[model samples]
Target: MSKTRRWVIILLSLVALILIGVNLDPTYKSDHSDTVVYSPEGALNYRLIAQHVEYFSDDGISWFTQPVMTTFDKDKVPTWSIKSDRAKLTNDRMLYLYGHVEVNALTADSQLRKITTDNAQINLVTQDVTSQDLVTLYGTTFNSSGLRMRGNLRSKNAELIEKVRTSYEIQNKQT
Candidate 1:
């Protein structure tokens, strides 16, 4: 074949191959082999005294602290940093509050106290919370202790226990 014709044929073949590849995978999604799996979603807000405020991954990596008291919310999620010593984030969807975490959820008549270790895993998908460290919970006037705590948001029903103290405390805090 002529040089010009051969070049044109090669170019056309390359173009056709590209078009076929695109047609096969329209979304063009790659394997993403280099991407880390534990990468969390949403921006994380944090603060501490004598610092300039910081943002971290939702997975608790790459964090910085601010000098002033700060309250920042990501996607309408509530995050609390107390006096630069402790902080917690109430996730928007799952409401998992971690980091020396203490969570208080209120109803029309009562409030529930949830405490956990430095890191607490609250599954929004399952509406369950599991903590490995010590937990001291207080509901209205009632108090309890356990290693893990799970409560229903709509019903205010909860189960608390360590390894052996698995029990339910029916407290009428509505009065």
Candidate 2:
């Protein structure tokens, strides 16, 4: 083969390969994994364990299937944990939890507090979680249900927003 013909064929092949690679949709997927993410100050921010994670290359969004996330405080201690049927993590430090979302935290009395909602939006930076859907809060002594809820995980404070109904369990002790 002539030198010019050989060079032309090589150039065309390279171009074709490049085009093929560019046109292919790239995705990263994993299964049965535990991923830990940290803050900029080297403190443990959160750890996510999921049955499956699917990340698209075009956008910095990760989709998780049956994910459970444990969030830590500034002292590197676990403050709260959340479990959901599906979750989407965005690039702006926002987590969107959907489908049977449950948030568990410790209250001031060192009692387990649980929140159940259909969907929730969590701001990782501010440690704030908000849900406009129906929310049910369960504590050791009390239970509440409302239409909206907002709370800070680090501060361990939560507010039931509208139409709040609370029930308290009172025990009688004989002195």
Candidate 3:
């Protein structure tokens, strides 16, 4: 009878522990806006600023509205920046931008005027951007438009794909 009582107490404790664990989860849904939301502690390689954001715990996804992700360089200066009308931040820190996606590259000596596309993806950790859509890049001395563009913000290198059209600024000098 004593052994039976001990087993019953242990079983009850196990059940109680399981119940407590289940209750420790987060809320089902939450929404935030007008602030820098959910970037984690400390300064990451980039800062994610958005006008609006919403999170879903069940699906582990966060959606942002007009979010601008600005990455830094070795000197911690603002290097590359990208924004869009709407974006989705996945669980693995992959940002998928949609609706008039735009990326601006800034280097120590130069800048890529504006790289615009319909959709794009940027890895927040690696600062790698990739897209297989129409892209137009306007520079100080040239204008290039193409399809299927890939580049890295950290390295500041962009490569154009097929159907690329490039035109340069021509100014007559030394007459």
Candidate 4:
């Protein structure tokens, strides 16, 4: 046999109860609520919680409605938390987050940093975060906005593809 060995683990399992359709067919999309999915990412694993999920078996794509995904450190401590109104997950373990996507991460000192973008892509396997849309970053005492971004959640390092501008103005949270 000249074919290479092939093995794959089914990481996408619904931790919560799913409300599948009556057909229960392979092509039928399954709907889930209050879903929690944990996937293996080599060194560590991450937890994904979605208010609603629609899984399409035909394409191995999952749609998330209001998802809040959290990544953990080597110590199993929570690191970065990403929230978005809508998100899509492909079989390649790529999470396409959009619609007011917000990334709240901890800096070197464990200080919170906020990054916002209308469109963002996160590689669940590699913990890489990138965005081609305009991204707005907020820090303790400064704010920056630019088009395109590249970063990794594990390293907590990110920079705009091109520097737009930087300001040292404090932002007041709208309550």
Q: Write the per-residue lDDT of candidate 1 for residues 1-175, one digit (tens) a residue.
A: 6979999999999999999999991222222111111114745332223322233444432222311222234433333222322223233433333345655442234355433345555443343556666666665566677766655433335556764332345744444
lDDT of 3 by residue, 1-175 (tens): 8979999999999999999999984334444353432234544466677776777788898888787877776566777768789998889978899998887766545456578888888876677878888888766677688888888777776767989988776762222
Q: For model 1, state the Cα shift of residue 155 in Å.
A: 4.1
User: Of the candidates numbered 2 and 4, which has the greater lDDT value?
Assistant: 2
* lDDT of the candidates, in the order given: 0.43, 0.86, 0.75, 0.76
Candidate 4: where are CA atoms >4 Å away? 1-44, 106-112, 170-175
What TM-score number comes out for model 1?
0.38
CA deviation > 4 Å runs, candidate 3: 1-44, 106-108, 171-175
Clashes per model (N, Cα, C within 3 A): 6, 0, 0, 0
Least accurate 10 contiguous residues by lDDT in model 2: 104-113
Quote model 3's TM-score: 0.71
Query: Local error of candidate 4 at 42, Å?
Result: 8.7
Question: What's the TM-score of every candidate structure?
Answer: 0.38, 0.77, 0.71, 0.72
Name the best candidate (by lDDT).
2
lDDT of 2 at 169: 64
lDDT of 1: 0.43
The worst-scoring run of ten residues by lDDT in candidate 1 lies at: 30-39
Q: What digit string (tens of lDDT, one per residue) describes model 4 on residues 1-175?
A: 3333222222223322243433353444444454444545555567777777777787788888898887877777778889999999898989999799998874345433899999999987679999998998876666788898888887777878776877775555443
Q: Residue 22's C-alpha lDDT in candidate 2? A: 100
